[PDB]
Amino acid sequence: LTGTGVLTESNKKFLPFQQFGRDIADTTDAVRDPQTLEILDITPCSFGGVSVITPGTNTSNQVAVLYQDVNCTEVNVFQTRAGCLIGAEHVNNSYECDIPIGAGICAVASQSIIA
Amino acid sequence: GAAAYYVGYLQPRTFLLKYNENGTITDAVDCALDPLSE
Amino acid sequence: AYTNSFTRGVYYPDKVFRSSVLHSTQDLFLPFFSNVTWFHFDNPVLPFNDGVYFASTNI
Amino acid sequence: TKCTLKSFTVEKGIYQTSNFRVQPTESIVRFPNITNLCPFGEVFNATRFASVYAWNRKRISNCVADYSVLYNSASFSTFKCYGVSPTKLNDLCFTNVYA
Amino acid sequence: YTMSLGAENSVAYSNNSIAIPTNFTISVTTEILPVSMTKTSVDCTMYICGDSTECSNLLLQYGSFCTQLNRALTGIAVEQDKNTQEVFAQVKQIYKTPPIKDFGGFNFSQILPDPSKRSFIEDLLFNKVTLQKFNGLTVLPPLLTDEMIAQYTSALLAGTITSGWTFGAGAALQIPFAMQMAYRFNGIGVTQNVLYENQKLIANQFNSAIGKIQDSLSSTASALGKLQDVVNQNAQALNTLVKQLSSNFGAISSVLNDILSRLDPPEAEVQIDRLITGRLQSLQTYVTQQLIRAAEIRASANLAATKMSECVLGQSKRVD
Amino acid sequence: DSTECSNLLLQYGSFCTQLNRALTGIAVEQDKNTQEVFAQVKQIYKTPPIKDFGGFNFSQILPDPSKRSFIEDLLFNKVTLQKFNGLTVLPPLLTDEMIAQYTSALLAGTITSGWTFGAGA
Amino acid sequence: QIDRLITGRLQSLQTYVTQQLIRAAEIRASANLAATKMSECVLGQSKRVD
Ligand SMILES: *[C@@H]1O[C@H](CO)[C@@H](O[C@@H]2O[C@H](CO)[C@@H](O)[C@H](O)[C@H]2NC(C)=O)[C@H](O)[C@H]1NC(C)=O
Ligand SMILES: *[C@@H]1O[C@H](CO)[C@@H](O[C@@H]2O[C@H](CO)[C@@H](O)[C@H](O)[C@H]2NC(C)=O)[C@H](O)[C@H]1NC(C)=O
Ligand SMILES: *[C@@H]1O[C@H](CO)[C@@H](O[C@@H]2O[C@H](CO)[C@@H](O)[C@H](O)[C@H]2NC(C)=O)[C@H](O)[C@H]1NC(C)=O
Ligand SMILES: *[C@@H]1O[C@H](CO)[C@@H](O)[C@H](O)[C@H]1NC(C)=O
Ligand SMILES: *[C@@H]1O[C@H](CO)[C@@H](O)[C@H](O)[C@H]1NC(C)=O
Ligand SMILES: *[C@@H]1O[C@H](CO)[C@@H](O)[C@H](O)[C@H]1NC(C)=O
Ligand SMILES: *[C@@H]1O[C@H](CO)[C@@H](O)[C@H](O)[C@H]1NC(C)=O
Ligand SMILES: *[C@@H]1O[C@H](CO)[C@@H](O)[C@H](O)[C@H]1NC(C)=O
Ligand SMILES: *[C@@H]1O[C@H](CO)[C@@H](O)[C@H](O)[C@H]1NC(C)=O
């Protein structure tokens, strides 16, 4: 079996005559090591979409980057429910939504990006 | 003291098996028995 | 001496692990509520008929 | 963004430009602990071959494979596989083999 | 049996006589309308090949197929937020409900929000219904969160109590509630005095009707089948799409990793090309059906917005 | 009725189930459009036996118990309406002599009662 | 050869179904308008012009 992912100890109780399992639709969840007979789950490493926030082309060449639904623990830094947004400056006061992001947060003012 | 023993035969009949939280088969429906199971 | 094979005869079709999920597969099984043969003596030889369900309770 | 939108000017707003993922590291391999080879010579180095109408057949199991000796050497006059690349034969684990 | 169409009555029609009402029942009615779907988004290049350079190498021979599909899905997820903005966000600003509540005896406490949490009914509604994603599929969040929508609806029905159709033209004008209802009666064709003389009975019927709705919803299942349907359809489309990955499509194997792991590039590319053709056709089918459903929802949202404009911010004259 | 073709069809997965479901959804919608258009009245009102509607001649609009109304028969004489394999057609839920009874109820209501018939009693 | 015939016929059928779905959606729109006209013009007296 040749694939990629993260191997973790499996609490999912196998039976003496099971080598690996699938939770749904051919998605193999675990496997028993052919040496130590231990069952480890394969949870694929995080991935997803990346989007760019810009004020345009003439207004500025600066840009903020949003990593959709990713906890910023992998590669300023501010976390939302849309995902982790890096490059924008967070502010407290509220305004009219200019550039929509998601989950009620929108984004340029005073020569920089604001969230 | 003759004891009893039952004997049946198998057939290729599609079954739908119900798995529990323990990964154990606890029920099943025979998909060609009657109109309801069908 | 016939009998009612109520629901017995289900088995694990493969060595793969599933849980908390319904799965439908096609294989050789024992049709539900079919009749079964009952023996108690006379032990004849028996056709194997592409698989055999056997059950009993120590002769 | 300019690259995806096919323009040297990109107006205001939000644009999705690509996906991302974290690349795998430190390759691992777990084969079974069994360590012993099969009598491959016994398959090729023998004169007791069966007649076609009475073709013989044996089984090969519970051993270490490695057929590069048979694959590359001129020992065989014909070497053709059906659905399997011979150059990967050593890296393919099987349940049994029938000869 | 052969179905009956209805009760057979025959109005006694002559030419010298008329029937006229001598009483009235005010009542309430619930009307349910969907206005959105889950903002589905799928990465085509990962869906078809995923973590395989050679596969995408062959995919490049089909040009922009992924680009067109991705773009179409973006255009629908965008108009779902447009639909929600168009139906709810029709109020210039956020009105507030005055703290002292003496609306002529009319008990509106089960419609207005309670700062403890949404209104009682809204909470019952949310708890009435029962709202996967593992390989290149995701769902984007909505722009307007639940608390933000419940803030629009609180501003809306906190306006129409205090100002009526007025607040939907210009500045709000405070008018005592009972006077407003009396006017609306004049608006139908019943002399204003009828409301004042019978104010107590009217308030009682209104309240006992709100309580009847509260209990109809609190007990009758399948109240929101129309709303549940959209969720079921979205879930079904996603589950079928995911399931299709196990289909062989005439290949030697349904898994790309094994074919690739054991076949020389010639035969391997052939089997890959077969798999790709199959998976691509499945994706095209999915996106087409999703677009049709989106168009139907767009029409539904437009109807809902129209109904809100004429029935909430004013008083409809058109019948039924 | 080709076993080999069937075998060569399973390799393509749930295509047929999906197509069948689509045609079922539309057929249900077709039965709903008629339930939603004609079935607007809860009772079946009937035209009074004596007809003295202030001089307005209705005899060509109302049903004629000889058979539908005259105009409807004319309409059914102006249109130009099988299955062989794998293809079929389902009958509608509401038959012709049922729809014509919804029309002959809404029309026997609007006459006697004005618009109140569909507002309340 | 069978695979070739199957792919072809399957595609022709999927095309048919797609066209039926679009046509059905347009008919639905028409039926909705008809329902509105029956509700507003027959069961009462519409005032909107034309
Ligand atoms: C107005 O008067 C008519 C004439 O009787 C009433 O019509 C009938 O009611 C009686 C029972 O009271 C029935 O037996 C008749 O079959 C009805 N139809 C006729 C006579 O054509 C009518 O009900 C009266 N209006 C009200 C509101 O009661
Ligand atoms: C119009 O109908 C209402 C329906 O409630 C009548 O109200 C009832 O009147 C009776 C007789 O006084 C009381 O016993 C009930 O308690 C009233 N019901 C409610 C809910 O308060 C009303 O009387 C009717 N109009 C006339 C003129 O009789
Ligand atoms: C409006 O009606 C609500 C009923 O929902 C009233 O609330 C209740 O008052 C009773 C009387 O003591 C309490 O037992 C209930 O617990 C209260 N809450 C509910 C949810 O029933 C409310 O007081 C009424 N207000 C006015 C002004 O009529
Ligand atoms: C594997 O086998 C070797 C000897 O054959 C032994 O030393 C080692 O402990 C074994 N490991 C396991 C996990 O069985
Ligand atoms: C961009 O900004 C400049 C000045 O800020 C303005 O002149 C121009 O019209 C804007 N739009 C463009 C370059 O498309
Ligand atoms: C993200 O990671 C932090 C720390 O690793 C953790 O506390 C948090 O629960 C995670 N999830 C979110 C949504 O922040
Ligand atoms: C925002 O509010 C929090 C909570 O009072 C405070 O700690 C923080 O300094 C504020 N930041 C700004 C930029 O106002
Ligand atoms: C099976 O799972 C249940 C929870 O669903 C648990 O209570 C039980 O201990 C598990 N093991 C069994 C039943 O052997
Ligand atoms: C046959 O015997 C010769 C002589 O030892 C040896 O070189 C050769 O490898 C043998 N053949 C096989 C298939 O092992």
- The answer to whether the CB of A99 falls within 8 A of the CB of A60 is no
**Is C10 in the B-facing interface, judged by CB distances under 8 Å?**
yes
Of A19, A29, A30, the CB nearest to C15: A19
Rounded distance from Cα A12 to ligand 4 centre (Å): 25
Rounded Cα gap, residues F70 and F60, in angstroms: 6
DSSP tag of F69: B
Q: Among D2, D11, D14, D28, pick the best mutation site for testing chain A contact (most A Cβ within 10 A).
A: D14
The label of the residue with tokens 């509630």 reads E177
The total of other beta-carbon atoms located within 10 Å of residue A94's CB is 7
Nearest CA to ligand 2 atom 7: E201
Q: How near does any CA of chain A get to the CA of D85, in Å?
A: 17
- The answer to whether the CB of A66 falls within 8 A of the CB of D43 is no
Write out chain D residues lying below 8 Å of A51, CB-based. 14-17
Burial class (CB in 10 A: 0-12, 13-18, 19+), E14: exposed
Q: Do E292 and G39 touch (CB under 8 A)?
A: no
Nearest CA in chain C to B12: C28
Give the number of whichever ligand sits closest to the CA of residue E204. 2
- Amino acid type, E62: Y
Region of residue A93 (phi > 0: left; psi between -120 and 50: alpha; otherwise: beta): beta
CA angle F92–F14–A44, rounded 5-degree value: 135
**Nominal resolution (angstroms):** 3.8
Ligand 7 pocket member A91 (CB < 6 A): yes
Beta bridge partners of F69: F63
Ligand 1 pocket member E12 (CB < 6 A): yes
**Is E263 in the D-facing interface, judged by CB distances under 8 Å?**
yes
Dihedrals φ, ψ of A26, to 5°?
Answer: 60, 10
DSSP tag of A114: B
Which residues have C-beta within 8 Å of that of residue D49, sequence separation ≥ 6?
Answer: D56
Of all atoms in ligand 2, which is nearest to the CA of residue E205? 20
- The answer to whether the CB of E195 falls within 8 A of the CB of E188 is no
- Run of H or E including A52: strand A47-54
The total of other beta-carbon atoms located within 10 Å of residue E168's CB is 18
Rounded Cα gap, residues F29 and F25, in angstroms: 6
Rounded Cα gap, residues B19 and C12, in angstroms: 11
Burial class (CB in 10 A: 0-12, 13-18, 19+), A68: buried
Rounded Cα gap, residues F37 and G37, in angstroms: 10
Ligand 8 pocket member B22 (CB < 6 A): yes
Ligand 4 pocket member D36 (CB < 6 A): no
Closest CA to C16 of B22, E253, A30: A30
The Cα-based distances of G35 to E55, E148, E254 in angstroms read 53, 35, 50
- The first and second tokens of residue E68, run together, are 């067109």
In terms of C-beta distances under 8 Å and separation of at least 24 residues, what long-range contacts does B23-31 make, across chains too? B23/A12, B23/A13, B23/A14, B23/A15, B23/A21, B23/C17, B23/C18, B23/C19, B23/C20, B25/C10, B25/C12, B28/C7, B28/C10, B30/C29, B30/C31, B30/C32, B31/C24
Q: How near does any CA of chain D get to the CA of A99, in Å?
A: 6
Of all atoms in ligand 3, which is nearest to the CA of residue E211? 5
Of E285, E296, E320, the CB nearest to G40: E320
Rounded Cα gap, residues D79 and E166, in angstroms: 91
- The first and second tokens of residue F89, run together, are 């057609």
- The answer to whether the CB of C38 falls within 8 A of the CB of C53 is no
Write out chain D residues lying below 8 Å of E46, CB-based. 19
Rounded Cα gap, residues G21 and G25, in angstroms: 6
Burial class (CB in 10 A: 0-12, 13-18, 19+), G11: exposed
